[PDB]
Design an enzyme around this catalytic site. Structure first.
Site, PDB file in Angstrom:
ATOM      1  N   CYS A   8     -55.113 -46.816   9.948  1.00 50.02           N
ATOM      2  CA  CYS A   8     -53.689 -46.734  10.468  1.00 50.02           C
ATOM      3  C   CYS A   8     -52.794 -47.706   9.752  1.00 50.02           C
ATOM      4  O   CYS A   8     -53.559 -48.950   9.583  1.00 50.02           O
ATOM      5  CB  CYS A   8     -54.602 -46.967  11.933  1.00 50.02           C
ATOM      6  N   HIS A  12     -54.008 -37.619  14.998  1.00 51.28           N
ATOM      7  CA  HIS A  12     -53.921 -39.207  14.583  1.00 51.28           C
ATOM      8  C   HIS A  12     -52.872 -39.157  14.899  1.00 51.28           C
ATOM      9  O   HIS A  12     -52.579 -40.271  15.974  1.00 51.28           O
ATOM     10  CB  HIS A  12     -53.728 -39.534  13.302  1.00 51.28           C
ATOM     11  N   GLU A  13     -51.712 -38.629  14.398  1.00 50.42           N
ATOM     12  CA  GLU A  13     -50.152 -39.263  14.791  1.00 50.42           C
ATOM     13  C   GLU A  13     -48.981 -38.861  15.965  1.00 50.42           C
ATOM     14  O   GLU A  13     -48.254 -39.136  17.038  1.00 50.42           O
ATOM     15  CB  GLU A  13     -48.192 -38.265  13.945  1.00 50.42           C
ATOM     16  N   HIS A  33     -50.413 -41.381  18.815  1.00 55.14           N
ATOM     17  CA  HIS A  33     -49.340 -42.546  18.977  1.00 55.14           C
ATOM     18  C   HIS A  33     -48.517 -42.729  19.851  1.00 55.14           C
ATOM     19  O   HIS A  33     -47.953 -43.655  19.750  1.00 55.14           O
ATOM     20  CB  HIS A  33     -48.498 -42.661  16.935  1.00 55.14           C
TER      21      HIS A  33
END
Ligand SMILES: [Zn+2]
Length: 183
Positions: A111, A154-155, A158
């Protein structure tokens, strides 16, 4: 252009907030940052450009990472021989459906906002269906699996204040789940 100084690091309260939904149409400024986010990705993937600016190569960037608490992400997954590539700037992305079956990157994940390597497996859904709007407010539906599904998860994480390491089992950090496909 966006640089590494624009990237906030783990410890910043913004990375743990729940990013705000965008009204549509986007503002001129929101369109520009999303374009700049994608452009940062393009730059970071170019060896020459990345070396001149000292960028870390990446295939995803979420608004919270440049201290903008809004639900927008940029995903740029290159090809490297397969003929399958992904290039999206999405707004208000959401996983509407997904498998029970898992998938994981054997080497774990990195990251740009985390400076030290954290070891452990990040098991995510192997297949996911996403709903989002593009930079013009048009509807986007994407059915992804494997690596691309992992990048998108993953995005999106966030946008909810979730970091990849939150998924690492602390007792058995490196034990692969049974029936989880390695990517
Ligand atoms: Zn990240």
């Amino acid at each position: 252009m966006l640089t590494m100084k624009d990237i906030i690091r783990d410890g910043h309260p913004t990375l743990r907030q729940k990013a705000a939904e965008l009204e549509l149409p986007l503002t001129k400024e929101e369109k520009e940052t999303l374009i700049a986010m994608r452009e940062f990705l393009v730059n970071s993937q170019d060896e020459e450009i990345a070396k001149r600016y000292g960028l870390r190569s990446g295939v995803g960037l979420a608004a919270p990472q440049i201290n903008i608490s809004k639900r927008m992400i940029a995903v740029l997954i290159p090809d490297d021989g397969s003929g399958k590539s992904y290039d999206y700037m999405l707004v208000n992305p959401k996983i509407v459906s997904h498998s029970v079956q898992e998938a994981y990157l054997p080497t774990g994940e990195g990251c740009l906002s985390v400076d030290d390597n954290v070891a452990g497996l990040v098991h995510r859904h192997n297949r996911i269906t996403i709903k989002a709007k593009d930079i013009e407010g048009n509807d986007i539906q994407l059915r992804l699996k494997g690596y691309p599904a992992i990048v998108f998860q993953h995005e999106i994480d966030h946008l909810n204040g979730v970091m990849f390491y939150d998924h690492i089992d602390k007792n058995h950090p490196l034990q692969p789940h049974t029936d989880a496909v390695e990517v």
